[PDB]
Coordinates of C-alpha atoms in Angstrom, one line a residue:
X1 CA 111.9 88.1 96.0
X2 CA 110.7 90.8 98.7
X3 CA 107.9 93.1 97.9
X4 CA 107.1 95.4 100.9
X5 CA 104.3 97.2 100.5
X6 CA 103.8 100.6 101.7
X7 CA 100.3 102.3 102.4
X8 CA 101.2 106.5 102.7
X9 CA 97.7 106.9 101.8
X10 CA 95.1 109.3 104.6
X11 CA 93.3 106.3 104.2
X12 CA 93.0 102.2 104.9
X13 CA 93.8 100.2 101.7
X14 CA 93.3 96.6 101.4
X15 CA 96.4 95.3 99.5
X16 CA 96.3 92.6 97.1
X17 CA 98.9 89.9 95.4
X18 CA 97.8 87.5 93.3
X19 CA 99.5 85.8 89.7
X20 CA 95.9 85.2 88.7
X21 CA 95.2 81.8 89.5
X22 CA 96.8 81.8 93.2
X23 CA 97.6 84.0 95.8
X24 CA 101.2 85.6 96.5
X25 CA 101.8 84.6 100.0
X26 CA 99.0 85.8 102.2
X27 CA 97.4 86.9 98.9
X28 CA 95.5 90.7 101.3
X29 CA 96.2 92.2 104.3
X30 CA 94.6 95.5 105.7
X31 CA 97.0 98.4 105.9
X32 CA 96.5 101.1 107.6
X33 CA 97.7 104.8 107.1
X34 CA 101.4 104.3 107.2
X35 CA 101.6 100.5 107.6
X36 CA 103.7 98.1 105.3
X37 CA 103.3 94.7 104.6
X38 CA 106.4 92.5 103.4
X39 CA 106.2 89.6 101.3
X40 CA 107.7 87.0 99.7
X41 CA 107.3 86.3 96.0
X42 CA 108.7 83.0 94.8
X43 CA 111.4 83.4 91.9
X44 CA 110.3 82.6 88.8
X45 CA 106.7 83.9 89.5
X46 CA 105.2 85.3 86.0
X47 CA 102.4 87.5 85.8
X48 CA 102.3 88.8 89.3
X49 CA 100.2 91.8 90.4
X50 CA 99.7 94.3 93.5
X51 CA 96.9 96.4 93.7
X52 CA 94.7 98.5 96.0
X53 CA 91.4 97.9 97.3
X54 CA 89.3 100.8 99.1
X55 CA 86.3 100.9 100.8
X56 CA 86.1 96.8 102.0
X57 CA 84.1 95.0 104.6
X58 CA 84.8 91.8 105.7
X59 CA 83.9 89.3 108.2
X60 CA 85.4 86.3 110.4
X61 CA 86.0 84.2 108.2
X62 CA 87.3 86.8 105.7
X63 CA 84.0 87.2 102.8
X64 CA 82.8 90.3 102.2
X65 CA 83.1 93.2 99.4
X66 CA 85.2 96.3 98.2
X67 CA 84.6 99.4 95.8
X68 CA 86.9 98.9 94.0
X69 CA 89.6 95.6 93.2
X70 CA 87.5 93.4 94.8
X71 CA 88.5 90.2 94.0
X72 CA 85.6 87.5 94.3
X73 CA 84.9 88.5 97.8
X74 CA 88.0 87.3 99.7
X75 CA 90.2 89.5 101.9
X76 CA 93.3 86.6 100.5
X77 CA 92.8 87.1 96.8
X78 CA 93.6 84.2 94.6
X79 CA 92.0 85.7 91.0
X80 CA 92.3 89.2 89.8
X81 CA 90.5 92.6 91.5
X82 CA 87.9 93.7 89.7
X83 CA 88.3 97.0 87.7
X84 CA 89.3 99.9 88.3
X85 CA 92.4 98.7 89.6
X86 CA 96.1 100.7 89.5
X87 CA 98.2 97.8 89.0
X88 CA 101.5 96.9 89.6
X89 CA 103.0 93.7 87.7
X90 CA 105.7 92.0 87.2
X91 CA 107.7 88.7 85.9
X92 CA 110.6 87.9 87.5
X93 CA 113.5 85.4 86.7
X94 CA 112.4 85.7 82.9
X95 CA 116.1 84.5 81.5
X96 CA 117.5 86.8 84.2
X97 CA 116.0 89.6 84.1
X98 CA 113.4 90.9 86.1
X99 CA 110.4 93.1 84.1
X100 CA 108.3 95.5 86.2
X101 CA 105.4 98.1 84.8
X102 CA 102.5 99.5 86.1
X103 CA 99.5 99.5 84.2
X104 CA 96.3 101.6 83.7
X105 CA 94.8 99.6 81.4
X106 CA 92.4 98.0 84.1
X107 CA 91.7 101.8 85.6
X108 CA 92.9 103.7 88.1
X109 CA 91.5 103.8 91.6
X110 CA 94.8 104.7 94.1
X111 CA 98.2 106.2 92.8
X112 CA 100.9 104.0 92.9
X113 CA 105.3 104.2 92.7
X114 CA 107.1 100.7 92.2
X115 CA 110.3 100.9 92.6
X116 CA 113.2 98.5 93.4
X117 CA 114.8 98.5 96.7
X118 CA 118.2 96.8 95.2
X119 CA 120.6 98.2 92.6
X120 CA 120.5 98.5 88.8
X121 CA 117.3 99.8 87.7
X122 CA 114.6 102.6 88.1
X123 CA 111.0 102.7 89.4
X124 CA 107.8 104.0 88.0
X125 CA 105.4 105.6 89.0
X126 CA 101.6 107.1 88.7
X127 CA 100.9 109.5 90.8
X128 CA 98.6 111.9 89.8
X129 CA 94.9 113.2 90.0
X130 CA 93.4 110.6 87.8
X131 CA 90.0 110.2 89.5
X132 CA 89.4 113.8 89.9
X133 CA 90.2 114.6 86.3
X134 CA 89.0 111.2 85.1
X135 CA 86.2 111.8 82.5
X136 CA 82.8 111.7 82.9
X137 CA 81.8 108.4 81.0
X138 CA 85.0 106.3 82.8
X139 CA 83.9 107.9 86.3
X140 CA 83.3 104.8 88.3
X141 CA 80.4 105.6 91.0
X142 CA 82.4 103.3 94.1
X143 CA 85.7 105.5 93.2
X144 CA 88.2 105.5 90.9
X145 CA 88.5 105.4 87.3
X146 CA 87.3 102.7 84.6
X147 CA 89.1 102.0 81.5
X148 CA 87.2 102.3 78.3
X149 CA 87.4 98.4 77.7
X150 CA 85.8 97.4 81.0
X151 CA 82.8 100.2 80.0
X152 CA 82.3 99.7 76.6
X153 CA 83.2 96.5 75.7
X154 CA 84.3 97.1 72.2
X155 CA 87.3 95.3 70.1
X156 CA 88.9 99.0 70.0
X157 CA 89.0 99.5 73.5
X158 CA 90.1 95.6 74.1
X159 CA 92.2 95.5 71.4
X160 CA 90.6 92.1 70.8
X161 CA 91.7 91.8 67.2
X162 CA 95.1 92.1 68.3
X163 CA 95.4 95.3 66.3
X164 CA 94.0 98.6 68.0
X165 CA 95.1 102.0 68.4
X166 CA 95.1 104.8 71.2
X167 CA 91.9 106.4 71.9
X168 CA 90.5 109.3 73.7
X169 CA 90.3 107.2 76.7
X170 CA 93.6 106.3 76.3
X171 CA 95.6 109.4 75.8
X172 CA 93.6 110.8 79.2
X173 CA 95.2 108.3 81.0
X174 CA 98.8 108.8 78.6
X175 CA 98.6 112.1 79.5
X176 CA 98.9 112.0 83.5
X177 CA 100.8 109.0 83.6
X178 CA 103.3 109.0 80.6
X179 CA 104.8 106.2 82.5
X180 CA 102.3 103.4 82.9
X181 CA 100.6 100.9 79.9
X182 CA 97.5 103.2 78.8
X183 CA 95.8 100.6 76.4
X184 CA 97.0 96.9 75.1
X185 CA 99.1 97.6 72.3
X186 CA 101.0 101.0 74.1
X187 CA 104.4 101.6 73.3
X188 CA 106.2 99.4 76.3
X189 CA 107.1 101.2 79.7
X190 CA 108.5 98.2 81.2
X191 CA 111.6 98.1 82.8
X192 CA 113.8 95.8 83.0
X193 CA 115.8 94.7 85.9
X194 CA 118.2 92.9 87.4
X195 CA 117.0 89.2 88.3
X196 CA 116.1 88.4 91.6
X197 CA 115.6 91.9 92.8
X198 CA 113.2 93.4 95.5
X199 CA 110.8 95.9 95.3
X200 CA 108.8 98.3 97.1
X201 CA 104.9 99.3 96.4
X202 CA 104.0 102.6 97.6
X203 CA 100.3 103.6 97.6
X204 CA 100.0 107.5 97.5
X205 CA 103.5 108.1 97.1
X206 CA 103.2 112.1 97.3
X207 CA 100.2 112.8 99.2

């Protein structure tokens, strides 16, 4: 599958891919205002994610450290970004059916649309002012905004019982973006696709 990956942000981003244990293709790139990356994500890939980083610096031999997402380090991330991270994420080829969603339930540090560039299905999106609304306790002091698992560590927040409800966290983040996971157990706003589709990630898809 193609993903190209669209940076409309004033500012440089440091995309990421990664299903967790590996990287998706190059795994980060830099992008400039304006620039897109394309890659390829191998069918059948399951538990994929693109997200932001902002505010990185790295070296030759690409170490170094972001604000926000950073992921170990590494420009070419192989694990997860740390929180707070917009993600997008997706399964694809699940019994032939692609499943795409974004999430806030790791934070929100850029707005995000994912969308599919092929027939047969719509995009989503989160696009508002979540870190200029965001609430003072989730207020993360690199940027963005935490979710109130990664601050507070509770089984409410993490729904680590496996049985949770919303919150007041949780309905901040419901309320801007009706269309993205707000806590674990959140009614679904997947979508479901056809398999084998492409997709594109826009960063700052209005301003």
């Amino acid at each position: 599958a193609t993903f190209e990956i669209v940076n409309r942000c004033s500012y440089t981003v440091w995309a990421a891919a990664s299903k967790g244990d590996a990287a998706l293709d190059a795994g980060g790139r830099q992008l400039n205002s304006g620039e897109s990356w394309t890659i390829n994500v191998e069918p059948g890939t399951n538990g994929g994610k693109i997200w932001a980083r902002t505010d990185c610096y790295f070296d030759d031999s690409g170490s170094g450290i972001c604000k926000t997402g950073d992921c170990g380090g590494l420009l070419r991330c192989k694990r997860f970004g740390r929180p707070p991270t917009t993600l997008a994420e997706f399964s694809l080829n699940q019994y032939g059916k692609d499943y795409i969603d974004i999430s806030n339930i790791k934070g929100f540090n850029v707005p995000m649309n994912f969308s599919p560039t092929t027939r047969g299905c719509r995009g989503v999106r989160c696009a508002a002012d979540i870190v200029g609304q965001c609430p003072a306790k989730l207020k993360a002091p690199g940027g963005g905004c935490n979710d109130a698992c990664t601050v507070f560590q509770t089984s409410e927040y993490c729904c680590t019982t496996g049985k949770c409800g919303p919150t007041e966290y949780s309905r901040f983040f419901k309320r801007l973006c009706p269309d993205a996971f707000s806590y674990v157990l959140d009614k679904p706003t997947t979508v479901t696709c056809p398999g084998s589709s492409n997709y594109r990630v826009t960063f700052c898809p209005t301003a």
